[model samples]
Structures are given as structure tokens and as C-alpha cells.
Target: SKLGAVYTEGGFVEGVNKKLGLLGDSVDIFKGIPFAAPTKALENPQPHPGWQGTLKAKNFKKRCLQATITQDSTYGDEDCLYLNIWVPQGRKQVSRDLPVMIWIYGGAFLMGSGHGANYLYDGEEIATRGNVIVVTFNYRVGPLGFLSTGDANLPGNYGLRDQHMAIAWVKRNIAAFGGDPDNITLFGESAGGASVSLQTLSPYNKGLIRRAISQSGVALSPWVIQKNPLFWAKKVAEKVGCPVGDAARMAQCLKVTDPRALTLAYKVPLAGLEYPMLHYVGFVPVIDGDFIPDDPINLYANAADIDYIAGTNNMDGHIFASIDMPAINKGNKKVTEEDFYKLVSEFTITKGLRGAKTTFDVYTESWAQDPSQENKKKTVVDFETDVLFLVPTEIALAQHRANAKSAKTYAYLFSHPSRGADHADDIQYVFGKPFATPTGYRPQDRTVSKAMIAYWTNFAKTGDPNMGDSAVPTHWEPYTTENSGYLEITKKMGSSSMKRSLRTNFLRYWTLTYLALPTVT
Candidate 1:
């Protein structure tokens, strides 16, 4: 039962598997590789300090400690900084010096895992198809990951730094696995998407990252940057029975608090936005002036030489809207038309300056007051999408492209008649999850998944999604201020054409109209 001996920086890893799905499909997988030491909770990560002999990396280890969303329970431990890798066998660049694509996960900065929670993070098909190295890893989440003191006493963003450590590790150790140390692309969705966007801004890992693909989230997305870490940091401290006064005392008390209680102690402040979930994700990256530097607007152009792709689904908001306004479709929660309009008002960042009138006029102009539930739902979804996902994406795409000397920028708007591909829906297609899961998807759905992965992995390989795959739908035109075209990804070929002036009037409301007015701090 000998697999293969792959040398890593720690030691030789011996549990790589050869056979993937179906017959004759060979892709080597090294699962659960410890990229860093069991990091101290709430502190920055340290190197793994090397293993004694060869590590049997067969099974995925525990994910970072965090509370479950639906269930009243917690799992994982403080020391769950591990990574998984998929290396291709035979391809143009498989044997040596292959481009590497690393995926960061998203769960609103609350809950997710790189290995478990689902088979969505599997990198086999992507590695094999793209002829590149695929990597996924875990970073701390919730209070344990972020809970900053607004000062150096307890610099939050340990989770963000954990990602940096993993990326640095891959850059140093991947050459042993035939991965090009110099070439790396970071990609993810939602929180992970914001992580990718934020990662590009970090001066710590500048030359280490070659490209980035931010889907449905970006640094400028309101919730990505933390504003009141100290307020919430002390709040979690009080909930977990820690010191409430000094930052150092609170940090010391929280350093040893039960990880489970600390992770679950986050509570919404009540006064700010109506739905705190959409406005303030309790623990998130801070504008610490180092990892995140200045405001996202001023910093986007600083991540020099990094080719970037940023996009969102046509209705990335339906997921949150459905949860917040259950009457939007079907859910246990219920919010009437009054509540729906209230949510929209809170969504407008400039609402404090009487911007809700403009917001309502722009979004609800076409629909009747007593519109159908579906139309109501669609409007709700569109407003959330523009404010949270689409507008931020276009800003990142524009800034990243315009500032670059030679680096490329591409954008996409994934839409399909079926499923509505709402919110994080593009993830399934990008990861080839339908194909990986056996037979859950329709045949055409599988076709859609194939086209997306081809585009995604191709972008990883050569910075052009259409260049690396022969089966791809069409040329993904680059983003320019004048052009502003995005590939309209759909099931129908040719229908997935590159379209221009994406959400022009809608996005301009936020970028131009809203920016010219007073707004929320």
C-alpha cells in the first residue's frame, strides 16, 4: 500500500493517493499537510518547526474552532492550521514549475473549513484540468480570528495573517512538489473573495502573489473591514467573563478563555444597521495600516503587478435577502413589504444623509408598490447585490486594471436561468463540484460546471481564462474604463458572450452619485 514519498519542508510526506475519480484518472493528492505550528488562538501564526520523519498526510485534520450556524454546537481546536494540495500527473506544466492556485473559503467570517464542511474545496479536477497546483487551507475564524483591541496590545486579524503564513509556506515548499514558487493565484468567494481582495493590498506578501480572483466580495465591500474591533472585542470579553477595562488585561484574559465560548460570544450591537448581519460581520480584517494599509480605495493601486479578476453572480444578494426577508421566497423567517423597504434603507450607506429617496427611486422605479412577491424579491436581491457585491467588484476591477502597468484585469457576471445562481452559487461550478459529487446535477448543469472550471483554472494558468482551455465558451475580454465589459457566463454557448456596460446605472449610483454626497462613517 505504498503511495509515494513527497519531500516537504517539514519532512517527507508519504500518504499521497494516485487514483482519483473514474478509471485511469491519476492525480496525486497530499491531504492535511500542516503548513504552520498549532498557532496560539488570537495570536499570529508561527512556522511548524519541522517534523521528525515523514508525515502520513492521509486524512484531514480538525478545522479551526468555531460555532456552527444552524446547530448550537462547536467543533475543531485552536491548532488547526493545515493545508491540502492536489498536484497533476501529466500535462504541459505538470511535472515541474507549475502555476499554483490557492482557494480561500467564505462563511461571512463566521464558519467554514478548507477540507471538511463539504467536498467543495476538493482540488483534484482543477489541478488535473488546469495543469496547475491547487491548494486549500484553514484559517481561524470568528472572535478567535479577529477580536482586535484597536491597538498593538492585541492586533486582530490573526486569521488574515494565518492565510499569509500559508501562502508564504507554499511559496517556500511547493517546489518540491513541482510547483512554481514564483507563480501563485489567490481565489475565493464571499468572505474568501474579500480575503483575496484584501490579500492583494498587504505589503507582507506582495511579490509572493502573482494574481487574484475575487468573487462576490472585495475590500471595499462594507462588511469586509472592521471598524469597531475594540467595542466588540470588549463585548466578547464581557460575554466570556473576561476583563472589561484595559486592552492588555482583556487580551490576557481572552488568551486563555475557553475557545468555544470565545468563538460564540460575538453579539450584534443593535443600534447601527437594522440587520447587523449584513452591515457588521463581528470579526473581520482591520485597516491596521499594515496588512490592510490605508482605505481600500487608496490601496487597490498599491498591490502592483498583480493580475486581477473580480466578479459577482447576477443576484448575489438573494441568499442574504431570503434569510433576512423570508417572504422573498420560502423560509422560516418572515418580513413584510414594510420590513423589506426598511432593509433596503439600511443597505444604502448614505441613508443617514437622506439618500434612501434616491436609493428607492433608482431601485424601485420600474416596479409597482403592490408588485408580485417575485418582483419584490428580485428588487430586494438587486439592491443588496449592487451595494454589497456588484459595485465593490466593479471598483476593484477598475482600480486594479487601470493602475497596473502590465498586469491584466478581467470581470465576469455569472447568470443562468436555472437556480438563479444567487450569491455563492458560482462556487459549485468553479470547483467542478457537480462532476465531483457523482450524479446530483443535471447533465447541462455538469456542462455549465465544466465551462466555468475551464475558465477559472485557465485564468490561473495564464491569467486568461479563455487561453488555456479549448472547450471554453468564448474570449473573456479584459476590463477597461471605456469598455467595462464582463463575460456573461451562462449555460447557452454564444449567449455567454462578453457584454459591456454591466449594471451601469445601478453601479454608478453608488460609485459616482453616492460618493459625491455625505455617507456613513
Candidate 2:
């Protein structure tokens, strides 16, 4: 009935009934497929060796090292480069050469994997329901993924490189699984979304993906890209008990060490630090001259030809200082202002700075880690979220519009407040699976899920995301200097103000502070 159960050129894993029928019959699910070689202990992802025979595409692979466990969030081995695929079952024939949607999970680039999720987003529902191929994958996280050591041998951002590999793998393989390689669309929330933006500018990832979407990641954070690689490498070396000066020796020490041991060290709180969050270490994308090239925002501001849609959640930074920081305990409710300040000071001031003012800046202004909050009403999440997620996204969209490329830039604001809801909440809606269980979406969630699925699926299939139907909304206006019209995704989806007023507040601060930093190039 459907090409008589044909197999992919890569191989096909039997679809498991994700049992999310309540989302309707348009769902099919597959999980745990490998995309590249695992770079667990090391800081980069090398592509998978070519296979002569069809490898089993059945179970999902182990996540690359990430801190997801409650005791430490740091678990898993190095071989975390893998992806899952979901598509409409019967329509494999009817929906020939369907669009592809790739989801990059967000966990602060510290923790979170595409492997384990009890939730119904098993990819089946979205794939079956929307006539699209859904792909999710695991990449390096925490120290193994980011953390630039400035070492010629071991500069950081292996995780980002791994992500690029996965996209490359999809381009090479998704077609065999029924997806049109040219119609791939990438989307993610929080760090995952930010990763999408950074990947867009990476020369290595240029044509691997066609459409891009980012949820809560922007390009303005002062350290968004680094000029302090040498300084930061020294800090990481001290923490990991490796010497900083000799690059060869550091590489030798790291090479033989167990990735798991390194992961454990990543979770250990720094001395005089009261909370886990205060110690910002062991994980961050590095500006490797070759792989990463330069700062992503700078690249966006220059010329780039790609379609993009990106925005932030209403409260993106809701968990930042509260969870990553050690002092704030929700149940006990006893954290004082002093505790927060102390943790921030120790972490931001990061010892061994050759320059003295670097220490002073940390002590005085709180390091400005995520400043999206500058325009919000005194909420930590909003301010930080805007700075990190929205500001950069808005800037990139505007810049892309100015480029000489044929591109459609869409911006959206997801404002659904749900349980276990910090980042990644938008996943439930975009995947079209929240209705199957009491996961995140609530009573009013169904409508938004339907509309969002339509918008995204349409975008994946064709460059224009207005669902291509006259009955639906017309082409979403390009984000521009004057008409900053973007999609407002909420229980109510329609055209609304990106509120350049709120955006203007963040724009100058990000540029002046980040672009003008003594260390920023």
C-alpha cells in the first residue's frame, strides 16, 4: 500500500507506536539513529566512518556526555552524535520527498539529550500528522562540547562541530528515509535555538540545512563568542587539574583521561562558591578560527544566504541564577541577596585574570551574563532571555534582510507558561504531541499546537511559512528597520508587535557591551 514497505538506502527501523493517537492519526515515530563518530572525552565530533553495509537504524544511541541527572546532570559517554527520525507512516508514498524538521534539544549546552523523553513527542505524531520528517539528535554538552582551552591541540566547541556533523549527516541520509534533502528546516529552543543561529554562520554548515529557527538564543552576550580564549583556557586547566602553559602536556593529560571523570569534575563546585550555578565553567562554544571561524553575530551582520526564523520564550532566563546558581532553594526559600552576590562574584571574577579590571567588572556589574532583562519589568528570566535569545535573533534577522541573499526571515515569540516549563516548553507544541499526555501543554494548548505545526511544516515544505493558503495569514512580513512584523505564537497566534521599543532597549546594550569589550574583536 505504501511503496510496499520499502527500506531506506541507509536502512529503516520499524516505527514504534508512540501511542499518541489523541494527537490524531498523522503521526509516526522512530528513535536513536547514529549520525557521526562519538567525541565523548575529546572536545569535538569527527564524522562517522562510512559504512559499506546498512547499519541498523533501530534504537537511539547513548547521548554524548551531558549533565541531565538530578544529582549531577553530568552523565553519558563521548559517542553522543545521533539523531531520531519521525514521519507520516502511510504517506511515505503520498508525501514523497516530504519536508524535514530537525529539532536541536536545549539544556544550556550543559545537559539534555534527544535520546530519553517519556513524553509523546516520539516524532511520530508530528511526522504522521504534518506530512513531514522529524529528526532530533544528541550532541556534546558541558565541558566536552564547549569550553575553549585556547590550546592549539584542544580548543573548545566540539559540541557545535558535532551539531554541524549531524546536519551534514541529515543532508546525506534523510532522503533515503523519505525526506527531501533540500527541504530541511532546523528549530530549537534556548541553547538549542542559539546553536541553530551559530550554525547558520558556520562556513562548515552553510548548505547542509535550508530553513532555520531559534527559540531563545541571540548573539549579544559579552562572551557570546570569546576573545579571551587564552585566559579562559587557563581557568579550565586550573579546574581540571591540568597545567595551562604547556599546550602539548595539557593535551596529553586530557587525551588519556576518562571522559566520565572529566564530566564529574565539571559538576564539582568551585571553592568559596556557595552554589552550583555561580561557577560558570567547563562549557561554552569557542571561536576556533577554522571550524567556528569568528563570532556568529559578526558573521550574520556580514553577508549570508539562508532563511531564518528565531525568537525567545516569555521567561527564557527563569532558571538561570535560580537553578545554575547554588544559593536559591525554592522549597526552603531562605536564600538571601548576599548569597546570590557572593556566588556571582566568585564565578564572574574567575581567578588568574592578567588584567585587574576584569575582576572589577565582575564584582561591580554582575558580569551581565544574560541581559535580555534590561527591557523587562524587573524579571530575571525576561531580561536575561531577551539579551541572550531575542536581541541577537532580532539583530540577525534584520542583518539577513539587508544581505543580498534571497531569504525569508520570520521572528516569533512563544509565551506559553506550562509545567516543567523553563526552556524546551515549545518542543511539545512544535512536535504536536502535548495532547497525548499531561506532559506540558494544558487545556488551551491544543489550538496553538495545531497552528504552530501548520506554520512550521509549511515552512519546511516551502520557504514561505504562511501555510501557503489564502485562507491562512499571508506571508509574514520580513523583519525590517521600520516594519518589525513577526509571528506572535501563543494561545493566540497572529501578527503582533515585536515591540521595537523593547528591542531597542536591548540592542545598544548588547552592541556596546559585547562588541566593544576589551577582549572582543
Candidate 3:
């Protein structure tokens, strides 16, 4: 046995976690702990079998196998159902009543590890500063976790259930780590943001989750759920030479097929209009009837009792908008009038809806002061931003606010300038990565991180973002339909204000009036 600090199951540790704990590990760590059994491909996760000896939750061993989100390679394994937990060591203020913040990562439900990009989501900095327990875990992604035949034989959403169980596991076991089992806040970004929002909608998650914070994604977004999983499932089946006609046989055939071959099979990147995101991935969580009984639009009212916080980056869909188009997909940073006109018409049609003419008419006029190509590109960026993230997430916030009969509701928008401030740019501040790495980040960014940590951790402690720390600099207000007042996060001021709601005309078109076209949903 390698000598060091040891914690048995409910006790000691081993490997890096134990060795480092004795040899200068700043935080107490329990990594790679199996929260479930080895995955069986395309099925609901089974309860993990207990070990006869002390399970050495030392360091991350495996991540769910898949191609890299932005790279040309593949990594991870099928046996990757584990969790990593952080408890701040030697913090005098940390107590048994500490609140728990569990993160579900985002990769369009096709890729992402709970360890997060380059360990940027590592819970060490968050636990150390917030003095609260933090958790991250891997769930099956892409085809492996979400492949569905759209019927009983192969109802998808296996990935969504993985999150359900992760929350349930944390609830049942967090007491061992000095966390209050009853108090848990689920949070995430992009697809991860959508995951937490759906978790709150499900009846199974009602008692397990206390509060939620969804950054730029939510369950109600058209891109988050696959309206026709069977079509996509058959596409993968056809790729692997399986029978596409029968759901049951297709399920069995795909289940036995090589996992990697199957994993890399589905490549349909259909952009929004009820089927995908700005650059949509084929596999996504589905309204599989059981885990998600109904469309989340109907379910938000049921969760009115939950305290919630959600918002978007200023240009959340800009990246996808540019990359999804052919002219700008690779070379040009600009779009001409024709380019913008073509795209807005293309993606806005859904559910027998067609609003390209009227849709383009509104967006084009809003930016009419300049006929420059830059303004044309702005028009596209705003269109993509509205369709993919801003409108849907704002709609989710509204639906969530509408249902807040007993609990509290709040909203926010990250608009700090001079930085990209685009999609996921706000993530650095939320995780305090600027402090952890301290490179490529300005002092202003760190200041934003400090306030964010205060607001986030404070909300975790209670249900209010402004409660625990007066040093946060801004007074955050609760959201109501009459006043859609939201906390505006910036490097200089971490406060609530109305500087961004000037686009009520656009927001109204998408949320209330867009249905008039009966075309692009």
C-alpha cells in the first residue's frame, strides 16, 4: 500500500487524493468515486454495486468516451460513471450545514467532461473560497446516452436520467461529507444549463434540488429537446447497417455495435427550428415521456416554488451563428445583406412555421442606421443570438417567473465589454478560474469573479443572491413579469439595472407575436 492519508468508503482515501492530502493537497478530495455501475450502452443507468474493499476515489480515471468537441480525436471510456468532490480543508468556518453546489457540464449533450475544459471547472477554487462543498460528475453523452427509437423499446433520455441519479446520489450521501442533504443547488451552462433546468422540471428532482442557476440554456429552448428522435435514431442505425424500420431491433443492433463506431456515427448538424441549436448536434435530451413527462413549457408552472436565477451572455449565439454559415464558416468575418437574408429565412422556419420574410423585415430594420457589412454581420449575430439562446432562455426565465407562486425568481445578463463577452465567456468568473490560473485574465476579471462567487455562493447559502455578502456592490432584485428587472453582471459593477431591456420590441416579437406567422417556430 502506498502510504499517505486514507479514507475508507465512508472513511479514508488513497492514490493522489490520499498521498496529496498527507503531502500538501490543499483541499480534501474524493475523486472517481463510482456513483453508478458500469454503463450498459443505451439503457437507464443501473445502481452501482458496492465494493468489498475501500474504494480508492483517488483521481479521475475515465470520462465517457466520445470525439473531442473541438478537436479531431476521440477519448474517454464506457466505464466512466464517477464523481469528484471537494471539501475545503482547515477552513474554520466550513460546517456540517454547508450547502452543496453540483454542476452538470455542457457540450450540446454530445461531448463534455465534468472535470471540465482543462480542469477549468475543477471545484478546488470554488470550495476554498466559498467554504462550501462542490461536486462534478460525468454522464453518458451523444448517441450513447441519448439515442432513441421514439417508442417504448428504445425511449431515449438515458443521459438525462444519469443526472437525475447523480442528484439523488448526492442527496443520499452528501451528509457524510458534512453537507446539508436537504440544501442543494444545481447549476450549469449551455447544454449543462439546459440539463439543470430540465432536472427542476421533472417530479423526480423536486425534493433533491433546492435552488437552480441556469446561465444561458434552459429546458424550454427548441434546441434542447429532440422533437423527432426516431428520425435521428434511424439515421445512426442506417450508418451502422442496422434495421431502421423496427425500433426494438434497431435498439438491440445498435446496442451491440462497437461503441466508438456508434459514438461517431451521428453527424447531423441541423441548425435551429425545433431540431437543433445554432449549429445543432443530432443527439440531445428528448421528451421521453417518463423522465420528462411533458413538454417543459407546461412543467415550468409546476416548479413555481423553486428559487431560480438565469440569463445569457450579450452575444450567446454569435459563435454558432458564424460557424454554421458557409461564407463565414471558415474565412470571412463579415456577412453581406444577402448572407443575412438567406440565413434568417433558413433557420426561422419550424413546425410548419415560415416567418423568414417578416422575420428578416424586423431584424434588418433594427440595425438600419448603417448599411456596412459589419452591421449586416451584427444583424446575423443578433438573429442567431435571439433564436438559439437569448429568446428561449428569456422565455424560460419568464415561464419560470410565471410559476414562482411560493418560491423566488431572478434573472441576469453578463454584458462586460472589451472582452469577447460572448457565449460561455462569463464561465471564467463563475468558477473563479481567473484566480486559480491567474494568466490571460485581467485584475478587473478577477474582481468580477469575486463578486460572482459571492453572489453564487451566497445564493447557495440562502435563496437570495444578495443575502450573505454586503461586499457584492449591487443590490439584486427578484424578477416578476410586471418588472423583468435582472442583475447585470459586469467587471466594474456586480449590480441589477435596466440598461439592456431596450430591446423589448425584439423580445416581444419572439415571445408573444412570433406565432402570428404560423411558420418558423
Candidate 4:
């Protein structure tokens, strides 16, 4: 549907570029374009200098400070807010500005980079094929990015502020890259998806973006505003030996502390912290009443203007919970159904678990004398995804449908399996990387890959994933609170179709009870 051309560093593979059809639509690929000043803990992001040449954005760059065992690993760096742009090629003068889709990558807000995911989220595949300019950048992560000493001085969520600035940058400069600044769509998955939802609530980003797509994230989840954040900040301050009252001093003290020490001070692995709202140690973006005024759910419900499509992948916890965690999969055992019920019950009780004697007793009864490893894993994963991913996504869709009659919304459930791997497995298929992973996808992988690209590209173009004339399955409807029909991309029988899951009961109950709980602020 589109063509691309690139002006990258001297060592680009011309043959692969040609094969990818990148040469047709890509005019220039710019790497390391600074979108905002490096936002340190406690400091707001500042403006950066605009670049002076045809910057080459060919290979993957270093990722943010992820848990990498070696230097060659894809992670690290506090100054990681850089983005890559892919504009239609050969149009020295692309008179008409194109729709811009800025991708926000997911790593539980713990790890992920815009550049390093090329192997999976290859922008070339979409940029050349979809006719939309694709862009991505890294935001601060872990203690370095999310920690809020819980004060105005060390106002939290610098990573989110960085994103706000990036959008601002796009508005100011994207026209030069053949992008329509006003016609911007922001999309992300997992933690990034949650962040997108957060942005919608923020008045700071209100007019910057017109459309949004949140994959596996929504207005509820753990990212929304809750009770007094100053209370949470005080707890973190006490843990780190800082004064919660004096914002400046607290910011300086924590900023100078070793990143490891900061992470270790709050790392309660078994606490089962949900995304955005990390347990024990609070590093989540705060509802300062300034940047993120009220709760996201409340904000959307009160004033519904933004158009959004929020979806979730089936078994979202498979990667975030199962992958590379010894404790989650102790002794290499599979989780069972009984284990799941007890764990879910206990976790539910732990929600307002501070001094509630009844809640504690209820939690105790929900568990056996000693829960099985398999049970813990299954229940933990299910609860985590339900609380952090699926429930929030559903609430966001329902609220949007209920309030915003003019806004268009779509809900989907990505159920395609990457052989026998966890949740990020779908990422591999969508990015054209399944062939290189241990999951070992076959011809079906190609089929799924092509379908994913088509769907994604279509959405990037039309703000909707439906292709009315395509030979592939169409007639995908927007998810409503009534039928709850969602797109499910799974491998069953001989082929796959966008179908509905009957588990809406669980999702609805969870949303009403937990994710949408009334907040103090």
C-alpha cells in the first residue's frame, strides 16, 4: 500500500531494505533524535536541541535500564528518551502530512526501549506497508524514572512527563518529517498501554493527541489516581531517609543515591505489586491534582471527548509472570485450579490489607496450609492480569461507550499463541520475529504475522482495525457493555477468527469490584 526510502548510517543492508519495501515509502530514517531533555528523578524534562542532518535510524539502539546480565544485553542508561522516525520515502516534498503513530513499548515500566525492539516491533514492516510514519522512544524506568518522593519538589512520574514532552515535540516538529501534528495517535502495550491511559487523564496531554490505542491497558488498572499520594511518598521517604515535606532536599538525596540501592530499598518481590501502583515501595505516577488531576476512570466518565481503542492480549501474565522468574515457577511446576482460587481470594483480601482483621482472616481462609507452586503461579498470574490488565481495559471501554457517544472505541483480546511461550509471544508474531525465537512458529506463524501486520497497519491508518474490503475476516464490532464481543486472535481448529470469550462474567465482576473502586482523591 505504501513505499519507503531511508538515509541511515553508512552500513545499512540495502538488500534487506529493498526486500522490506522500505525503499519505497521511507524518505529518511532518523536515529537518536532527542525528543526531550533527559528527565532525571525529581526534575522536569527540558527542551533539547534540534538535529542538523539526515540522521540515520537503521539498527537497534541501546535499551533503557532493564535487567541485563551483560553489557551486550539490551538495557541500561538514564538518558534514554530518544525516538526513531520512518516517513514515506522519495517524497522530497510530501505535500500532504501523514498520520503519525507514536508507539510506546511495554516492559512493566521496568524494562523496554523504542529502538532495541526492531527485531519484533520492526517499524519498517509497518512504515513501508501501512503508509503511516511510525515513531518510538524510551522513557525512564524503575526507580530512576517512576519514583516520587511524594512531594511537589520531587513530583513523581518523570517518565510520564517525558512522554508528555515527546508529544509536544512531535506537535512542534513532526510536520518537517511528513507527519500531521494534529492528527496524532498514541498507542502502547502492557505498561506502555497503561501509560497511554494515564496520558488521557492528564490535562497536560489533552489537546496534544487526538486518538489513542491501548493494548492490554485501560483507565482502571493500577495507573489511575487513588488516595493521598503524599501518604505513599512519606512512606518511601522514611524508607530512603529523606524528608517528605521538603521536596527539593528529598529529590537531591534520592537522585544521588545509587540506582541499585533505590531499587533494592523497595524490591519486595513476593508482594505482588500491580503495574503503575508498585506495592510496598510506591514509584507510580501520582495524581498531583496538577498533571494527572483526578482518577482516569473518573476523568473519562465525567468528560468523555477522546477517541480510544483499548485491547488486551489473552493470558497477558504468561510473560510478565512466567518468564525468567524462579520464584514464580519454583521447581519447574505447573499451576493448578485450586491453587488459583485460593491465591485469587487471598490477593483480593490483601487489596486494602493494612489493618483489616476481617480481610486478613478472609485471606487466610482462602489459602491452604501450604499452597502448591503450580497453584501460586496460576492464581498469581490470573489475578495480576485481571487486576492490572484485563479489568482496566474493560472498564475503560465500558466507560467510553457509556459517556462518549461521539467517540469511537474498539476492544480486542489478542489470543494468538506463540507456540508454547508466555504473553509477549504475540509481540514476536506481530513484529515478524517469531521465526527467530525459541517458540518455533511454523507456516501458521507467517499467516498470523501477516494478519497482525495487516490489522495493525489498518488501524494506524484509519483509527480503526477493520478492513471493509479485505479478504481476511472483517465485520469486527466495537465492544459494548451488553454483548462484550471482542476480537480474539487464537489458533484453533483449522483456522482462526475474531471471536468472543465467554469469560466476560469474571471480567465484569472484577472491574466493578476492584479496578473501579472509589478513590479518595
lDDT of 2 by residue, 283-363 (tens): 667777777667665677333557788776666656664555433335344434444344334433433232224323423
**Model 1 — which ten-residue stretch has the worst lDDT?**
267-276
lDDT for position 449 in model 4: 65
Model with the higher lDDT, candidate 1 or 3 = 1
RMSD of each: 3.0, 6.0, 3.8, 6.2
TM-score of each: 0.93, 0.79, 0.91, 0.77
Model 1 residue 255 distance off true place after TM-score fit, in angstroms: 1.7
lDDT (Cα, tens digit) per residue for candidate 3, span 17-56: 3222453434667788777888988878988866565667
- On the 0 to 100 scale, the lDDT of residue 183 in model 3 is 82
Per-residue lDDT tens digits for candidate 1, residues 1-521, read 12278788888896565855554556778878998889787788898888778888788888999887643678888879999988877522337788899999998877789864558788887887777889999999888888788788888889999999999999999888888888899999999999998888888887899889998899889888888889888888888888797878888998899887887786544334456256567788887766777788888666668889888998888867666665677644343456756776776655563676677767777666666556766888887788788888888888887688778889988886454678778887888777878588888888788888888878887878878743687888888888888998887768448889887988788778866767666
Window of ten residues with lowest summed lDDT in model 4: 7-16
How good is model 3 by TM-score?
A: 0.91
Give the runs in model 3 whose Cα sits over 4 Å from its true position.
1-26, 69-73, 90-94, 268-280, 326-334, 351-354, 417-420, 494-502
Query: Which stretches of candidate 2 lie above 4 Å from their native place?
Result: 1-28, 38-40, 47-56, 68-74, 90-94, 116-121, 226-241, 268-281, 301-303, 321-381, 419-422, 438-441, 469-475, 494-503, 506-521
lDDT of candidate model 2 versus the reference? 0.62
Q: Which candidate is the best by lDDT?
A: 1
- lDDT of model 2 at position 249: 81
> Residue 354 of candidate 4: its Cα lDDT?
32
Task: Write down the lDDT of every candidate, Cα atoms only.
Answer: 0.80, 0.62, 0.77, 0.61
Q: Name the 10 consecutive residues with the lowest summed lDDT in model 2.
A: 371-380
Candidate 4 displacement at residue 294 in angstroms = 0.5
